[PDB]
Structures are given as structure tokens and as C-alpha cells.
Design an enzyme around this catalytic site. Structure first.
Site, PDB file in Angstrom:
ATOM      1  CB  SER A   1      -0.958   0.003   1.176  1.00  0.00           C
ATOM      2  OG  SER A   1      -0.313   0.429   2.371  1.00  0.00           O
TER       3      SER A   1
ATOM      4  CE  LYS B   1      13.271  -0.024  -1.012  1.00  0.00           C
ATOM      5  NZ  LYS B   1      14.674  -0.499  -1.077  1.00  0.00           N
TER       6      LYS B   1
ATOM      7  CG  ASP C   1      -2.566  11.378  -7.530  1.00  0.00           C
ATOM      8  OD1 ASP C   1      -3.485  10.756  -8.097  1.00  0.00           O
ATOM      9  OD2 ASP C   1      -1.493  10.855  -7.169  1.00  0.00           O
TER      10      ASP C   1
END
Ligand code: A1BU5
Ligand code: A1BU5
Lengths: 273, 266
Positions: free
Chosen positions: A19, A21, A128
Site C-alpha cells: 500500500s 519505500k 491526485d
């Protein structure tokens, strides 16, 4: 109100998450947290700008935006530290075998409206919005994230800067699809929201029957939207109306989050809560 | 975006508050400020204060729906709140449960956080300026017109209790209000919410009570008979500190109170 400069020694940080790094990390005193390691490699430059952009992203404090707790900025590694949302992102929660009631889905939508109303209130374009960027706590209350770092240029470029050892399309408004250099507006975020409403009642990503990407882009630009008949479970007609209104081809023909909140809140309260 | 110029003909028919019916948009509250002679020379200034009033749009502040500017009638038109003000709601025969009182407090914090976010000092937060809809959700109001000088003058020319006022402003009318001025008020509001009454009931006179408050007098915590969480008693003491600097910010309050509300009261 200034940023908390955390050390690597303060954590015993875990393996990655899918979900992301991005990893879960344990702070020695303050407890469980989420860490986004942006850079690992040799020394570099932009240190003042990143720490100022962190200050900038620390400014935006609301119950429905994910809070930056601190940053790691050391010799050759740069990381963002943020509060732990136990149930993960929205799309992860919807796909789980545990039933999400209508009242909860209703509250989730109001909480997103609340959060978007805040960011637009501070003159922020998200650029976004998508289920990935909507995180969910153990009580099914939500907070909005910018894990793409859409609104933070120096951090976003740092990821692909130089010597770095270490999705959107479905929710992107058609005006910006296949546009190398597009300027996103507030009404761009309103389109994304419309696709999110659909996803909340579908319990899945849209456009499952798409074959190629250039097919999907050209489709959406030519007026294709998520299949409303693919909503199998009950979705109130008021919300079906709302998502069609919000994914209008014409940006100006979409409403604004204040406009949405004013209609949705009393509907939520009277019918869904 | 801009203010709506409404007509008196568009209606049925603290200030002369009347509930009025808009012919298309439906039921509203109208504050008719001026009725009598003509003052058309300064109509631009009122409409400029109206734009300022119109810019504040949040779920926990009363919205200006529009204004009437006519020959000798001047009105503010604002959204309807069924149960009236907070003090009226607390005094009702129906006991308002702890969970609801908790939610009320979070919604006040939400609203005050918004106003401060827009660079607004309320200056006169109090239960009268906190209005309650049919589902016990609240919205903060400026019915005194504290932040709107031309309208407030117009309100009280032909045709104010101190219980929630920070001590820095008691007997100092030139002292500039800060954000922390509002935070003291909020502290006294918390007290009133668990008291179900106005404080300082057995004061002798207001001159003497003011001097008492400036020397560190605060509402009697033993006058709270019904249950109040200890961390709310702590919060109201921290918010009514003598030193403005020693009080938290509404952001500071929200971040402590919200998770307390959720974990203990929701
Ligand atoms: C980058 C970070 C810390 C984060 O989520 N946010 C920082 C602040 C609050 C929150 C956020 C969410 N949506 C948009 C913006 C803008 N503009 C934003 O800015 C995380 F994704 F790593
Ligand atoms: C005056 C009016 C319309 C009203 O409540 N408000 C106008 C806008 C929103 C709301 C309000 C509430 N608290 C402070 C301010 C400030 N500054 C404020 O400004 C009503 F009392 F008639």
C-alpha cells in the site's frame, strides 16, 4: 508548528508495505508510525528547501488530512514520518470480507468532502485524489494523503533525483489525460471525487473491461465514465445523481466541495446516519 | 461567490430577529437592523462589510444567505436554527446527554478553528452566539455584530453580559483582542455546558465581580452537580488562565480533545 527533526536511531523500522519505500516503524517513546523513505544513496543540496517544504506540508492541519509527525534528513537519506492509519487505504477497506454498512460509506464520503473543503479552503489543489490517498483508522474515520507528493515539487523530484538506491489514470479528469504539461484546477479534484463515490459503492476499481491504456484514455476523453449498472449493491439515487454531476465533461459544469457539502450533509444526516 | 442582494418582496412578512419565508429558497432568519429614515451615502460600506460576512462558509458557522439594501429598510438574512441558542437548549426539560454535550464541544472547536484559520477573532463567543439545529448540531454566530462595525452601529441607533469575556478586556477597551481572547470565552462555555446555567449566580454587583475576575475569580467548579469528565475540567482551567500566552490554540485543543471525544464519549 515548525517540523520535528527525527533521527534514524529513534526507530526500529520494519519491512515495506504494498500500500506504499513506505513502511510501518516503531518510535521508541511516541509509539507506532508510518515512514516514507524518499532517498537512499550518497551525499547531496536542496536541504533547506526540503525542510521548508516539510514546514509548508506541516502547516495543513485538519482531522481529515494525514499529519506529518516529523522528517529524517541525514547524510545520504531523506524520509517523511506520518501518523499510523491502522485499516490502510480506502480501496483496501472496501475489498475486505467484512461488510462496510451504508451509514459508514455515507460518513466516509462526508469526511472526504470535509477534508477537500479544507485543502481548497487553504488554496490547495490536491491534483491526485484517489482511494490510495484516502487512509482509514480502526474506527473507520478517514484522512487525505499526498503520497504521490503532487503538491511538493522538491521531495517528488528527490525520489528520481540521482543515485537513488530505492495508478492515477482511473481518477484523473479527462482535460489532463494524455496531457504532457497540464495545469490541474480545483474542478480536476471534483472529477476524481466522482470516480471515488462510484468505487465506494462498487467495492472495486473502475474500467475492469479495458484492454489497452490508449483505449481507456481515448474512451474517458470521449465521455466514458464508470458503469453505474456495475453497482450491484444498493446506492441511493441522490449519490448516483451526484457522481454523474461531478464527472461532467465540462469542468465548469461540476460543483465545488462547499456546494457538495451543503447538499450532501443534510441528505447524509436525514437518510444515512 | 459574491453576496446576494435580496428584496423585502421576496419574503412573506441581537436585533429584531424575525423568521421569514423566501418565495423560492424557503425558510430563513432575518435581522432587520434599520427601519425609518434614509442613509444612502454609506450603503457601499455596509455592502463591503457584507462581502466580508459572506466570505466565511463552514458547517459550524452561521451563513449569510443575503442582505436587503432598500430606501429605509436594512436586513441581514441568515440560516434558520430550530432549537435556538445553546443556553436555551441546556435549560429545557429534556436532559441533553454527555455524548451530545461532547459532540457540541468538538463542533465549537471545529468552528472556532475555521474562523481563526480565516484570520477572524470572534471577540464575543458565548452560548447566545452558539445556535442549535433540530439534530443538536451547532453553528457559531456574531449576532452582536462584534466584527462588523457599520451594521452594529446601525443596529442600536433609535427605532451585553461579561461572564465569557477574558480579563485582559475587562476594564481595558483599548486592549486589542487576540485569538487567546476567544479561548477564555470557550473555557466559560465548557463550564456552562455542564452547569446548565450562566456562572457567577451569587455575585453582589458587576463592578466588584469584574475586579474579582481580574484578580483570578473563575466559575465555581462545585456548581457542576452532574458528571463532567476530569480532562474537560482540566481543559477549561487551562483555557481560562490569567496569562493569554498560557492558553492553548484551538488547533492545540482540537488535537487533544478529538481523540479523547472519540475514545471516551462517541
Ligand atoms: C505528504 C504527506 C506528509 C501528506 O499526506 N500530507 C502533507 C500535507 C497534509 C497531507 C496532504 C494531503 N493532501 C494534500 C496535501 C497538500 N498540499 C497535503 O499536504 C504524506 F503523503 F507523506
Ligand atoms: C452576523 C451573522 C450573519 C453571522 O453569524 N456570521 C457572519 C460571518 C459568519 C457568521 C460569524 C460568526 N462568528 C463570527 C463571525 C465573524 N467575523 C461571523 O461572520 C449573524 F449573526 F447575523
Amino acid at each position: 508548528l515548525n517540523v520535528i527533526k527525527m533521527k534514524s536511531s529513534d526507530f526500529l523500522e520494519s519491512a515495506e508495505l504494498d500500500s506504499g519505500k513506505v513502511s510501518l516503524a516503531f518510535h521508541r517513546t511516541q509509539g507506532l508510525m508510518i515512514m516514507k523513505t524518499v532517498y537512499k544513496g550518497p551525499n547531496c543540496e536542496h536541504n533547506e528547501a526540503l525542510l521548508e517544504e516539510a514546514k509548508m506540508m506541516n502547516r495543513l492541519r485538519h482531522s481529515r488530512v494525514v499529519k506529518l509527525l516529523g522528517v529524517i534528513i541525514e547524510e545520504g537519506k531523506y524520509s517523511l514520518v506520518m501518523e499510523y492509519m491502522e485499516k490502510g487505504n480506502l480501496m483496501h477497506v472496501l475489498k475486505a470480507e467484512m461488510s462496510t454498512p451504508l451509514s459508514v460509506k455515507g460518513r466516509i464520503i462526508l469526511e472526504i468532502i470535509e477534508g477537500m473543503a479544507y485543502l481548497h479552503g487553504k488554496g490547495v489543489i490536491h491534483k491526485d485524489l484517489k482511494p490510495e490517498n484516502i487512509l482509514v483508522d480502526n474506527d473507520f474515520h478517514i484522512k487525505i494523503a499526498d503520497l504521490g507528493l503532487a503538491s511538493f515539487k522538491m521531495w517528488s523530484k528527490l525520489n528520481n533525483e540521482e543515485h537513488n538506491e530505492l495508478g492515477t489514470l482511473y481518477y484523473m479528469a479527462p482535460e489532463h489525460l494524455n496531457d504532457v504539461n497540464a495545469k490541474p484546477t480545483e474542478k480536476s479534484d471534483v472529477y476524481s471525487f466522482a470516480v471515488v463515490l462510484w468505487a465506494i459503492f462498487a467495492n472495486k476499481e473502475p474500467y475492469e473491461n479495458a484492454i489497452a491504456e490508449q483505449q481507456l484514455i481515448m474512451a474517458i476523453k470521449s465521455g466514458n465514465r464508470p458503469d453505474v449498472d456495475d453497482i450491484t449493491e444498493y446506492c441511493p439515487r441522490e449519490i448516483i445523481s451526484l457522481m454523474k454531476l461531478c464527472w461532467e465533461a465540462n469542468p465548469e459544469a461540476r460543483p465545488t466541495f462547499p456546494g457538495i457539502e451543503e447538499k450532501f450533509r443534510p441528505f447524509y444526516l436525514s437518510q444515512l446516519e
